[PDB]
Amino acid sequence: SQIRQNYSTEVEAAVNRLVNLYLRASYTYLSLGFYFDRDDVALEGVCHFFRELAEEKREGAERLLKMQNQRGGRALFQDLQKPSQDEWGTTLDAMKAAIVLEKSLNQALLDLHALGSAQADPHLCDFLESHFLDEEVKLIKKMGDHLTNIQRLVGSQAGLGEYLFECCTLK
Amino acid sequence: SQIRQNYSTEVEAAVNRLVNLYLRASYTYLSLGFYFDRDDVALEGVCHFFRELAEEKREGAERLLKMQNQRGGRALFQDLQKPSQDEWGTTLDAMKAAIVLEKSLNQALLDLHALGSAQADPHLCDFLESHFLDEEVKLIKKMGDHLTNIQRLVGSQAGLGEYLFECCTLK
Amino acid sequence: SQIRQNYSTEVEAAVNRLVNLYLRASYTYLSLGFYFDRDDVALEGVCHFFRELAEEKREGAERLLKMQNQRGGRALFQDLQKPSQDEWGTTLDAMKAAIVLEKSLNQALLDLHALGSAQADPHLCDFLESHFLDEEVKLIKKMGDHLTNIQRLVGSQAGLGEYLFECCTLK
């Protein structure tokens, strides 16, 4: 506690809250993944998509905790609330719930970035820019693409046909 | 007949009955497989699924017979009844018939396990646990997954679209 | 300007106009490609098809410009008009717009060929025959095939089924 330099108690606390948010998100994705593995749901690609995201969110939490120690802050852990639902409905319902979750993580990142800028903490700002902000933009874009394709597929025969052309002829 | 130790006549007889059940199941799966190979049915992946299961059930019977001789019991064979149907309907009908068949094998395994536990025959109990009980749980889970996906595919355009998203986008 | 031989001012000017047409076509295909990359359109195979065509049309322009210098003519560049639409509708709408665009390039090639024949410029005529006329015929044929398949897929269950048979059974 001989290393801390330019690291505010406000950022230290906000990092611990962000770690809680990322571990909550990881927990939500674990629940999503095992719901799609139910024998009465049985979409094993959807289960894999969500289990991979649970791993990504735990890795984001671990990166934050590594950074907290690099800066000389102190990790503090809080209770992890259970996910918002016990059953996640259709693939469409689940993808909508996932984009809501990612937008909430993204807003927490943007709020922490703004705190770090106000505190003139450029290490914190660049840490977020380099490891989190573009990862979130890329994931939200992918989820938006998925939402549009699920809506196309479930909505009409014109939509299913247009999806199949892209899948079987172009790629 | 110099090797038998802790092997009850009750377990010996029950093993011979189980071999009959597994060979009957193998016969049922042979009939299922060649029904899907009919030029007027022509689902060669369904034919392959059922022919592979016929091989698995014959292998289970052979493992039981190997174990009967390892314990010093005497294999006794009975007539093999023909399968319950000559025509198996749709893929859905066939998968429902297959899960009924597997649940009946699983209950026969559980009943033999309970007999072996009552007879304090731990070799028999562990034999079943190690080679049969988890194989049955894994297969029944796969069949339940298949049933749900066939029901999704044949039922509606929302269901077919949700299946295709998992197939063409996620995997 | 010691190399020019049998190269008319009429062909020189027509080549510069053709370069403008090919760069306009490239620009149109860039706009088509990024429209299909929108999160609310999200057909990434369609996006790739059109971005590849933008590259092909820029390469055709560059070949023309290389030839202009090989003959001792002088490249002159004009303003590039923006594409005709800002949004391109469905895959069907887009493919119809692409075949209209290709037919217009093809007619400009045929008109330049006829000018070169009238001017007795066989180098120009063979240049077009060797690098452009069959490329256009092959691309227009592919686009016509795509149009028919998109129409089949979006139109009816008989059409979608016939497409799927070709895709999943024959190839």
Added chain:
Amino acid sequence: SQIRQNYSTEVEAAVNRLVNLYLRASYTYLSLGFYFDRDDVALEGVCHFFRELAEEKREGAERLLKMQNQRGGRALFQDLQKPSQDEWGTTLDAMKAAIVLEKSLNQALLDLHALGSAQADPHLCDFLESHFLDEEVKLIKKMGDHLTNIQRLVGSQAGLGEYLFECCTLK
């Protein structure tokens, strides 16, 4: 919900409680690991030991959840309580806390085994025997070995010398 066979509501609920215990244990080990990564603690081998155990406990939870779905039970997730301490003291303190935690997991496994035996659920009993009970016995033995060696090292010069002989001469 067409697969469930011989799977009691008592075992189903107990499995969900066990998943909670394993995820709580994983969380405890995450906190232990990052405490040893503090610049004022700085035992990076101890940090690695505990982070590896956090991964093992999450994998145990995931195996339980996979099994819950294989049997046709329904995963239900509860709030994850935060670890018991925010600071973990010395390596000795931490290893003592880890063996207490493992003994509590082991007793929960033994209690679930006894429930499964009472319910005549041999699949559950063998699942625990095959994937959990010997993993726990091996880990508790390793932790007991570590406790004894830490006590030897911190206690006396005779103990440190005896440790060093084993380390530098025998291995």
Added chain:
Amino acid sequence: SQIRQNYSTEVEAAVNRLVNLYLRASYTYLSLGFYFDRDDVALEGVCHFFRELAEEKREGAERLLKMQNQRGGRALFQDLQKPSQDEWGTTLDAMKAAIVLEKSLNQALLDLHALGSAQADPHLCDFLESHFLDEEVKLIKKMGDHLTNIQRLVGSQAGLGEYLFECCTLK
């Protein structure tokens, strides 16, 4: 002097001062390294640690000078003051002196970042974020870890034993 764009005389001068600070730091580390190579000190791993840091600080100076020329500023060199001590005491004394030196470099980087932000010079800000700020945070963390371990080792038999357990058993 045809390239300079958005590069203030304030930043240009501050970069030249920073180059002086980094070359002074390199000189300090050369002196530290050869002190530990004295036959009456003889800690050749400590000598190597400090000689590697002398190379890192010279490389940081060279990167700054490359950037000064990339922006169209003019390198100006000043006298390099000799290091603060001729003898560096124990490994503990030396590591404390090294963390003081690194914190002073880090504060000079943060001050230059703040100047660049005030001058709206994002190239300068990102240059520092990308090549210097995280290098300093990682090095200061490592030095803090080293300080804690040296203090543990020299302070007590409990501390030495805890160090040895991590070294000989865990890693």
